[model samples]
Target: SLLSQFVSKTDFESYEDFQENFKILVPENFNFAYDVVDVYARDSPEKLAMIWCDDYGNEKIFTFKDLKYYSDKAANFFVKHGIGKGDYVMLTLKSRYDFWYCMLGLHKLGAIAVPATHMLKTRDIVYRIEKAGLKMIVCIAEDDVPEQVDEAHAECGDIPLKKAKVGGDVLEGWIDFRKELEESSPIFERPTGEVSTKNEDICLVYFSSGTAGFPKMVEHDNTYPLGHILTAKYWQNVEDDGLHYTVADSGWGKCVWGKLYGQWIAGCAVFVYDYDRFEAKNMLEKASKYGVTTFCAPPTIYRFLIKEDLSHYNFSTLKYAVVAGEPLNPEVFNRFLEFTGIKLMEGFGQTETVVTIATFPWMEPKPGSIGKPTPGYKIELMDRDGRLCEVGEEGEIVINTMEGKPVGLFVHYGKDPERTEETWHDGYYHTGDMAWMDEDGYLWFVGRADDIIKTSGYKVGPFEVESALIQHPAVLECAITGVPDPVRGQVIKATIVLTKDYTPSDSLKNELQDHVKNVTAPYKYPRIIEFVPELPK
Candidate 1:
């Protein structure tokens, strides 16, 4: 198997054994496009790489050979436009098959690919273009994205930003990507000498969803993909020659987490369902029809699935399932298991890193825990005093990098040295998130450090309260926050959106508050509840 080339041992007796023994052999000048993708093409041309389908009954299949050929053509097309090593190129392709071609092509050229969601507007586009000094942009023609890109370029002065579109009518100044790709040469030789990519060179950058301030740039090196071997093989449990599906848009880091990097390294076919709107029934139908062997999604997706009549769908072909992005509520976990008889393996990580903690194949999944630390990471829980926390005590989650930078961790926060040192100091990378570990080593997530509430001499995490509230049928979604108080340190506030069948009423509010008191400690109940049509996404 291809895994043997990078990983020495493929099987382990337990989670402890896997964590102690697993190691990835890194090449001096590692390039995923040349080493993994092209290797597969040469070894077995017929090996399936991707299975893409749209909501409108359109389907397309690609082999490794096809990927190599199209990517080579894409490389030629890019080089023709003066885009090469170290240049920044933004992609706004929303789940289009062209996203794969463009990404692989960028990898071949050693150019950094900045994938942005099509949801960005003119101001967002201007911010990214100016912040990164983007040389070019590749976008889909489906939405107002092309129009926004045009407006952004015009506003950013004469930066000479090249524009290209994939599947749309000929715009005023944009180059037709498909036409150019089809006309370009199909052969591209690997670069040697000065232009070659190295392990430390930055190849990808992601603009984090800035909840507190302007978005910061998160950068990853070429060795980033190798770090996800544990993420795909153990956490997601992707099978060789099997079809695996990860529900994510092409723009986010989760896209690579479940859809791209590690799954391909494990020799599985990545399945993508391109839908503009999300519906639980349609998602289940597609997964069943395509015979998906493994699956991964966030908690929000799972919540929607459990609300449906799950017995109407066929999940027999699915051998494993995983959840991340948010803490998995026990109610959702128990319900999903009840319907499909498969446990939901919860994982924890950030846009800045790969899977740090996860429920691996060798362990039994605890309902609310985010599982144990993955093999490469040395996990620690640090209190505000800069000391380790005792078992069952909440503290900030930090990773020890004193030995050296781990395989999948980011090189540094781009152009933000002050912030970088602020977070990465004292021989550890401090994750601002909070959590606690049990005696058995399973970690349970608390809210973020700033989101934790101090009320009447008690520290309350928003996740626990939110989890309890979600179990009630009246609650559809909720956000928990702390409001300043004169007497108490702070009062807990719950901003909620009710389920369609329920309405905002004094009795319903009292019942929900009582329900939280029953589910957890009575002191953690929300003192104030406000109904809203929707919460900020």
Candidate 2:
């Protein structure tokens, strides 16, 4: 397999052995478009690269050769529109196949690709365009995304913005992406000399969900894709010649992690299901009918899947399943395992990096734990005093970069060196997330550093309390936050949404509080419970 060309040790005896030996042989001037995709095109042109399907009965298959052809044409099309090296191109293509084409095309031109969610409003779009200095926008017309873009463009006065629309009627002053791709020449050669990309050149930009303030642009270099070899191969367990499906929108970082980079390099055909709305039954049917070998999604998806009648669906082709985005509740994990007979391996990561910690194939997956740190990551639990935390001690999760930044770590916060330095200084990158390691080396996610609650004299993570609450049958959704208390520093509070079968009452609240106390540490139970119709996004 071509995977051998990059990995030093493809076969590992155990998790410890894998951690000790796994190494990626990075080449000089590495570009994912030229090195991985193009190499596969030249060597294995007929190999299946992607299988795309939509809820509306539309389907398309792409081979490495097809990708090479379309991406080259896209490059020509973008070049003709005056997009070149270092130019920022924003993509709101959702899960359309055009995302892959435009992304690879941008890579070919050494242009930075900024993929945003289609749900962004005019204000959000304007903020990103003005902040990132976007030169062009390639948007999908399936929804009102292009309309939002047009509105955002109108708000920004005469910004050097070139607009392209895909799969919709061509708007005035906007080029048709599909028509242009078909018209453009497909004989683009690799750029050389001054225009060529280097390993350190910025290739991708992702907007971090700004819980603290405005969204920060997370920048990754050309070698970023190399970081995900571990993500797809070991963590997600994507197989050679197998079909892998990861449920994520193109706007998010998880798309690159599961949908594109590592899966292709590992010799797997990525499956894309473009659905306007997500349904558990439809997801099951698609995965079964398409014969997906490896699968990944967030914990919320599993919660929904468990609510469905699993006997109606066939997941025979599924060998491995992984979960991320949030900590897995034991109830959801056990229910999924009961139906699928496959353990849900949970992994931990952020937009700033690839999979940092994961339950590898060799390890036993603990329901609430996020497994151990992956190879090449130096993970640590730092306490308030800047000292390492002991086992069973909850502290902020941090990555030790005392030697240097590891592969897959983002270079810096784009155009915000002060913010980058604030997080990545002192020889460690502060994750602002809190977790604790068990005696057996498994990492259990607490809550974010800011979400920790101090009541009486005990510190509690909201995630643990929320995970416990989610285990109760009545709770549909849960959020744990800190409420000010004069007696105690801060009290643990749970704002919950109940299932249709349940009602909000004093007895119900008492039952929930008791359930949490019994499910987890007694001290971590939420003293204040509020029933809400819904939680804010």
**Candidate lDDT (C-alpha), each:** 0.86, 0.87
lDDT of 2 by residue, 1-537 (tens): 367888898989899999999998888779999888888899999999999999899999999989999999999999999999999999998899999999999999899999987766666688799889999999987667787788889899876699999987758889999999999999997789988999999999998743344568899999889899999999998988899999998988999999999998899999999898899999999889989999998777777888998778878899999988754678878898999899999998888999999999999999878899989899999998899999999999999999877889999999999889888888999888789999999999766677656564344556767767888999999998878754354678999999999988999989998887655546667888999999999
Clashes of each: 0, 0
Residue range with the least summed lDDT across 10 consecutive positions in model 1:
208-217
Candidate 1 lDDT by residue in tens digits, 406-496? 9999988788787789889999898787899999989997656777675643446677678779889989999988887643446899999
- The C-alpha TM-scores of every prediction are 0.84, 0.85
Give model 2's TM-score versus the native structure: 0.85
Query: Model 2: residues >4 Å from true position, as ranges?
Result: 451-537
Pairs of residues clashing in candidate 2: none
Steric clash pairs (candidate 1): none
Model 2 Cα displacement at 404 (Å)?
1.6
